[PDB]
Amino acid sequence: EDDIEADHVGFYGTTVYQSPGDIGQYTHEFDGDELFYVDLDKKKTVWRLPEFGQLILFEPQGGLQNIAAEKHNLGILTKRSNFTPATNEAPQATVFPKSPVLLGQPNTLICFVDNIFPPVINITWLRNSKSVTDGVYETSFLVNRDHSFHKLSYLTFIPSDDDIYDCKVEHWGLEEPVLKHWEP
Amino acid sequence: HLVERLYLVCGEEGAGGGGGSERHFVHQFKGECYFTNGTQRIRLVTRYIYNREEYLRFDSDVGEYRAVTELGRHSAEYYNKQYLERTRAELDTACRHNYEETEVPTSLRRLEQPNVAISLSHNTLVCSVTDFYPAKIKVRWFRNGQEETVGVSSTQLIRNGDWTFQVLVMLEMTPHQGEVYTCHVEHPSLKSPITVEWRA
Ligand SMILES: *[C@@H]1O[C@H](CO)[C@@H](O[C@@H]2O[C@H](CO)[C@@H](O)[C@H](O)[C@H]2NC(C)=O)[C@H](O)[C@H]1NC(C)=O
Ligand SMILES: *[C@@H]1O[C@H](CO)[C@@H](O)[C@H](O)[C@H]1NC(C)=O
Ligand SMILES: *[C@@H]1O[C@H](CO)[C@@H](O)[C@H](O)[C@H]1NC(C)=O
């Protein structure tokens, strides 16, 4: 329970798999930010910012290899643990803009969700209590040192004096969806 | 002439040894490469985790797999028999290669200049410093040309998840006609600081 001291840290990479449901993810990170994930069904590398893949490749087979190995390890460890199931955590969210809010100037609203476990979640946005799906992006599940995850959702918006926003989080560890409110 | 990013191999346990209402079972593998002073020092740590419990770890400072908990006691013996030399070799073929050949030309060259703005919110000035990369930054407050040390407070560094950061830096102040307050930002993307002034 003590940090390792370093100038930089690469996660090359991180793998998670869970059963039942056959849900998994494979990513690489550098200094805490996502480089890519591998789409395991499409068998393709998806870069976090398109520029990352202009000079560099990652073969998706590496992600398929890690996921296959983790499915194998999960079977063995599940039995060895006497079939001890995961504990559903209660995630917690905070909402903040990317840039200082200026009238009429396009901006991005960020919903940061922490203490996610297992890594299955729905994060959605409301504007003036109405669901908004246009201009919404999500990160992969990013790893925490205690082996939970965090995730961020992004909502393109134009600040006004006539808009109220909510981030809505649904998770198995929540009895009812939690709403995180935000106004200028 | 694309360059390949490589990965740390997830070792397999030996077999046969020894939905909100549904149970779920989770396994994780984390391959971590720690770098200091370029690649002069590299440390490799791989972790195998059942649900939330890390039970097995390779740490290149130790040089072999070790059980982290009782759950990993026989795992560590099996992995040291099957994967020990392969894992030791990944420090060079994966960690060092990725750093020197893929991070040096990309991540480590990324420079995003901060944007700086001041707002007043008895009382307190707030300097919002946004959209910068990398994380190393220094934010200083001045009043009429002299640096303020208190009451200067800062939020935590905020990670936006899009390879930028932001931070808020606050100054406890009382406005008088007609002082000048300056937020002063030094960052590796800037040859000389960015400053913003605020006047009563
Ligand atoms: C995330 O949202 C989806 C879609 O609303 C949920 O999937 C639905 O779940 C309900 C009740 O469990 C089912 O009756 C629907 O048939 C599902 N719809 C689809 C399209 O699959 C999902 O359960 C939510 N996830 C979490 C963790 O709450
Ligand atoms: C395993 O789980 C079962 C049911 O939860 C319990 O009866 C038993 O004591 C546990 N331990 C072992 C070693 O079987
Ligand atoms: C950093 O590494 C270089 C070569 O790898 C070495 O020559 C130099 O002395 C190191 N600097 C420090 C402060 O250790």
Q: B101 to each of A28, A55, B2, B98, how far by Cα in Å?
A: 15, 11, 10, 5
Domain final residue, candidates A57, A85, A113: A85
In a domain, A108, yes or no: yes
Are A109 and A68 within one domain?
Answer: no
For ligand 1, atom 22, name the residue with the nearest CA: A122
d(CA B59, CA B124): 47
> Are A141 and A51 part of one and the same domain?
no
| A interface test, pick of B3, B6, B7, B113 with most A CB neighbours within 10 Å | B7
Q: Domain end: A69, A85, A101, which one?
A: A85
Alpha helices in chain B (DSSP H): 73-82, 84-90, 97
Instruction: Compare all CA atoms of chain B with the CA of A148 and give the residue at the minimum distance.
Output: B52
Name every chain A residue with its beta carbon within 8 A of the beta carbon of B17.
76
Q: Which residues pair with A94 in a beta bridge?
A: A112
Q: Are residues A41 and A125 in the same domain?
A: no
Domain count, chain A: 2
Q: What gap in Å lies between CA A101 and CA A89, rounded to an integer? A: 33
Which ligand 1 atom sits nearest the alpha carbon of residue A171?
27
| Residue A60 parent element (H or E) | none
A104 plus A40 within the same structural domain? no
| DSSP secondary structure letters along A13-67 | EEEEEEETTTEEEEEEEETTEEEEEEETTTTEEEESSGGGGSSEE--THHHHHHH
Cβ contact A10–B35 (<8 Å): yes
Phi, psi (rounded to 5 degrees) for B82: -100, -35
Among A30, A60, A85, give the residue marking a domain's end. Answer: A85
**Given CA atoms B35, B38, B42, B47 in this order, what sign does their dihedral have?**
positive
Amino acid symbol at A164: I
Q: Which residues pair with A166 in a beta bridge?
A: A126, A181
User: What method did the depositors use to determine the structure?
Assistant: X-ray
**3-class secondary structure, B138:** strand
Cα gap B170→A162, rounded to integer Å: 28
Instruction: Give phi and psi for B71, each to the nearest 5.
Output: -55, -30
Q: A150 and A106: one domain?
A: yes
Residue A131, min C-alpha distance to chain B (Å): 23
Nominal resolution (angstroms): 1.8
Q: Residue A138, class by beta-carbon neighbours within 10 Å (0-12 exposed, 13-18 middle, 19+ buried)?
A: middle
CATH (domain of A103):
2.60.40.10
Q: Which of A5, A7, A8 to probe the B interface (max B CBs under 10 A)?
A: A8
- Token couple for B61: 């400072």
Helices (H), chain A: 61-80
> What angle (nearest 5°) sits at the alpha carbon of residue B69, between those of residues B67 and B71?
90
B26, containing H or E segment:
strand B25-36
Q: What would the 3-class secondary structure string for A79-132 be?
A: HHCCCCCCCCCCCEEEEEECCCCCCCCCEEEEEEEEEECCCCCEEEEEECCEEE
In a domain, A163, yes or no: yes
List the domains of chain B with CATH numbers.
22-109 (3.10.320.10), 110-200 (2.60.40.10)
Report DSSP letters for B101-117, one per residue: IIITTTGGG--BPPEEE
Is there a single domain that holds both residue A161 and residue A142?
yes
Distance B62 CA to ligand 3 centre (A): 23
Which CATH number does the domain housing residue A39 bear? 3.10.320.10
Q: Is A177 within a domain? A: yes
Cα dist from B65 to A61, B40, B74, B184, whole Å = 25, 23, 11, 49
For residue A1, tell me if it sits in a domain. Answer: no
Q: Which residues pair with B45 in a beta bridge?
A: B32, B59
Kindly state whether residues A108 and A182 are assigned to the same domain. Answer: yes
Angle at A107 between CA A136 and CA B126, to 5 degrees: 130
Q: Coil, helix or strand for A48?
A: coil
Same domain, A69 and A160: no
Give the DSSP letter of residue B133.
B
Does residue A122 have its Cβ closer than 6 Å to ligand 1?
Answer: yes
Q: How many interface pairs between A and B have CB atoms less than 8 angstroms apart?
A: 210
Separation of alpha carbons A81 and A165, rounded Å: 44
Q: How far apart are CA A144 and CA A75, in angstroms?
A: 23
Q: Are residues A74 and A103 in the same domain?
A: no
CB atoms within 10 A of CB B132: 25
- Clarify whether residues A116 and A27 are in a common domain: no
State the distance from the centre of ligand 1 to the C-alpha of B19, rounded, in angstroms.
9
The region that residue B190 occupies, defined by phi over 0 for left and psi between -120 and 50 for alpha, beta otherwise, is beta
Per the domain annotation, does A156 fall within a domain? yes
What range does the domain containing A67 cover?
Answer: 6-85
d(C-alpha A116, C-alpha B181), whole Å: 42
